[PDB]
């Protein structure tokens, strides 16, 4: 295990930059006579500075940091490329968090307690057998192998945060890790009700949480900053990231968790990060679940949600996106960014300021202008000049080039950063002005969004039911989500059911009601676990955590609600009333609280529709992947299905007039507008390009009809 560490693999790139620099000091010192030579004048440091500049920019190891949650960035770090299963992989690098894609086996995350030796060897901690001292275990310690340091040695941070990890399959355990690093920060950031002990330790070390450096007392507490008055007398202050756009567009917001009069010890959490609450990772919310299949709306993976989640903004998340536009150094001259647009209504630029940039706090819908800008003209139609001269408008140059909002997105403008030429600032050559606009979106949870839990289960939101019609307990308390059972008797995902019952045990509390001792299931238990109040968090380590016997014992003990009625039996089931018909559901249905997440895949980003749009230059086909109107790809596999049906025209329409006919797609849009018949397709541009490619290869191709020997496309 070489385990090239960042600094060591950085040094290796400096070797090449220095060695190739020394090759020049050998040659260029000979031509010039001596006493005109110094290590300074001859050494050109370009190869040295180019190597480091070429490393971060071009190296595959230098990666764009992935942070939509503190855990994703923490696990992006500690990740390692294995390109160059076994007993040595146990306790050093877990194959458990390898991606589910084709790169499985080449990519893995470092274990929790793994330490790196200076030479690159991975040292596992352990206790010689049970001695209290801890020594570094490795292949050298594999020679004389006799006790491990602790459980979850082979388990990483992402995997160690899955409660009841031992019950789920390695696949579902693997998917659960990837699902956690896909969560998005919610505005509320409610902590998990049931979990392991890693939430606290992983949150503070992620770096996105505010930690106190020295013991003291807070002097001031504000949304902007927090000041701590230390007993030593020194004064420390912490500026809080407020609605900062992350790398992938997730709002990074810090909330102060302390007050002025509080006295904080060193290392304590002063403010919560985006996905943390009270100093521990909160990647989702706690919701009331029902495992009954509900009239096919949760069919096969789909999940049904209560409208309460939309009303109370529990799954709502803020998303921010940056837009940029630049200025002069153009083709036919330098253009200027101005509010004036060539010909538009006064109401269209109403939200634009004196410079022409969208004013902060203003709302923007699809197509609205963000930054107004003009270009140099060609200044070179007759029919347009007549109307211009008639009504008095003039051929003021110009071509309208404005930064509009992309199709299918909306929000409010939080801030604008402008870089002008008047001020001396740093900018690329010729570019006079640079302005970046940041737009934020408050995204309600919507049908189609992808939700998932910690056990690898995932599925889209099938339907959002109004709060009135939902399976609800005799309390009148509706369930938040409704899951389905049919997944179990192939994949079995047992852990998903365990935390569901423990989620209800923790929400309602319990009291074992010991009489004449404690029951036998509490034999291996401590005394503090008994008699807990409602809404109590619970920690179950991966391999040393709870067991089935203690669970049912807690299922038997449930603090009733206000009126004293018990809502859940020892089987974790309850009689739910159909909110539509009113009749109760004939059988008891399992209910509880499960911790679910909101994955980065969202409907607003994944929906696309195009009627007409821009087309590529070389190939006249439409082009997707820009800010607007991406076209869908019709491959040969789809062409095979289209041929299997025997539909000749449908296939011809897609490949000629919908894609590549230069004169076709314009005359169809014309015929559709007039309401006429759609014309017969022409020759696709792809085929005309094919013939020229053959002619350039010195192959004389000729398209011959029945007569008139050869025809030229033109």
């Amino acid at each position: 295990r070489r385990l090239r560490t960042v600094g060591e693999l950085i040094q290796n790139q400096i070797r090449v930059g220095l060695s190739r620099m020394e090759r020049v000091v050998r040659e260029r010192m000979t031509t010039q006579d001596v006493e005109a030579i110094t290590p300074q004048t001859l050494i050109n440091i370009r190869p040295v500075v180019a190597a480091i500049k070429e490393f971060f920019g071009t190296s595959q190891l230098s990666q764009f940091m992935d942070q939509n949650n503190p855990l994703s960035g923490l696990t992006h770090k500690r990740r390692l490329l294995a390109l160059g299963v076994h007993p040595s992989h146990y306790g050093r690098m877990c194959p458990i968090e390898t991606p589910e894609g084709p790169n499985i086996g080449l990519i893995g995350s470092l274990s929790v307690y793994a330490r790196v030796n200076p030479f690159g060897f991975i040292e596992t901690p352990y206790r010689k057998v049970v001695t209290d001292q801890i020594d570094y275990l490795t292949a050298d310690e594999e020679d004389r192998h006799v006790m491990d340091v602790s459980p979850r040695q082979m388990v990483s941070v992402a995997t160690a945060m899955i409660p009841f990890l031992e019950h789920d399959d390695a696949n579902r355990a693997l998917m659960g890790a990837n699902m956690q690093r896909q969560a998005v920060p919610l505005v509320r950031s409610e902590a998990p009700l049931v979990g392991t002990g890693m939430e606290l330790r992983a949150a503070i070390d992620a770096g996105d949480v505010v930690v106190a450096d020295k013991t003291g007392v807070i002097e001031e507490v504000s949304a902007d900053y927090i000041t701590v008055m230390a007993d030593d007398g020194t004064r420390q202050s912490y500026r809080l990231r407020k609605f900062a756009r992350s790398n992938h567009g997730t709002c990074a917001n810090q909330r102060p968790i302390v007050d002025a009069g509080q006295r904080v010890e060193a290392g304590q959490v002063i403010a919560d990060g985006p996905c943390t609450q009270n100093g521990e990772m909160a990647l989702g919310k706690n919701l009331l679940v029902a495992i009954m299949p509900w009239e096919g709306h949760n069919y096969e993976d789909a999940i049904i949600l209560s409208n309460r989640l939309v009303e109370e903004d529990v799954l709502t998340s803020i998303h921010i996106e940056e837009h940029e536009i630049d200025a002069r150094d153009t083709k036919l001259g330098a253009e200027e960014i101005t509010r004036d647009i060539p010909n538009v209504s006064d109401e269209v630029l109403a939200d634009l300021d004196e410079r022409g940039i969208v004013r902060i706090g203003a709302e923007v819908r699809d197509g609205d202008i963000l930054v107004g800008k003009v270009t140099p003209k060609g200044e070179t139609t007759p029919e347009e000049r007549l109307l211009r001269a008639i009504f008095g408008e003039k051929a003021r140059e110009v071509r309208d080039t404005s930064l509009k909002v992309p199709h299918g997105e909306s929000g409010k403008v939080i801030g604008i950063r402008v870089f002008s030429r008047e001020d001396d600032d740093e900018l690329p050559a010729g570019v006079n002005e640079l302005v970046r606009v940041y737009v934020a979106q408050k995204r309600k949870i919507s049908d189609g969004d992808k939700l998932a839990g910690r056990h690898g289960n995932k599925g889209v939101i099938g339907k959002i039911l109004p709060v009135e019609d939902m399976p609800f307990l005799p309390d009148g308390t509706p369930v938040d989500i409704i899951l389905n059972t049919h997944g179990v008797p192939r994949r079995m995902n047992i852990g998903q059911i365990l935390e569901t019952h423990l989620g209800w045990v923790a929400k309602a509390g319990w009291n074992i009601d010991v009489a004449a001792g404690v029951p036998d299931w509490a034999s291996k238990l401590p005394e503090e676990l008994y008699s807990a109040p409602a809404d109590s968090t619970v920690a179950t380590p991966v391999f040393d955590g709870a067991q089935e016997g203690e669970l049912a014992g807690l299922l038997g003990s449930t603090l009733p609600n206000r009126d004293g009625e018990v809502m859940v039996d020892a089987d974790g089931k309850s009689t739910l009333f159909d909110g539509r018909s009113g009749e109760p559901f004939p059988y008891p249905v399992t209910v509880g609280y499960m911790y679910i997440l909101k994955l980065h895949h969202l409907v607003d980003d994944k929906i696309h529709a195009r009627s007409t749009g821009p087309y590529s230059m070389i190939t006249q086909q439409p082009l997707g992947g820009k800010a607007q109107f991406g076209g869908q790809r019709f491959g040969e596999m789809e062409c095979w299905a289209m041929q299997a049906y025997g539909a000749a025209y449908t296939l011809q329409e897609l490949l000629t007039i919908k894609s590549d006919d230069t004169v076709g797609r314009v005359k169809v849009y014309e015929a559709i507008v007039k309401g006429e018949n759609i014309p017969e397709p022409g020759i696709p541009e792809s085929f005309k390009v094919l013939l020229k490619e053959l002619q350039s290869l010195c192959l004389n191709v000729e398209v011959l009809s029945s007569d008139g020997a050869a025809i030229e496309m033109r």
Binding site: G646, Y649, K674, G675, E676, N677
Partner: protein, 82 residues
């Protein structure tokens, strides 16, 4: 049976396939007639050609392709197969 067809599924393809040879002949059957109806509705079509239709009672906003299917269902027109 089949209490009542709704929208696209009306008329049934089984009662349509009796009017032509194959399902592919059915496509060209109703497609070219839709070209004739949509022509007539816009106005007289190509050089020295008077186009007729619709033959059946038109719907409220019924499309010309949906009309031609009801026309074939009632044997209101014959075509020369092949």
């Amino acid at each position: 049976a089949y209490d009542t067809p709704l929208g696209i599924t009306n008329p049934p393809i089984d009662e349509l396939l009796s009017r032509a040879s194959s399902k592919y002949a059915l496509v060209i059957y109703a497609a070219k007639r839709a070209r004739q109806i949509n022509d007539y509705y816009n106005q007289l079509g190509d050089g020295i050609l008077e186009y007729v239709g619709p033959l059946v009672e038109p719907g409220l906003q019924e499309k010309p392709l949906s009309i031609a299917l009801r026309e074939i269902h009632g044997d209101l027109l014959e075509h020369t197969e092949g």
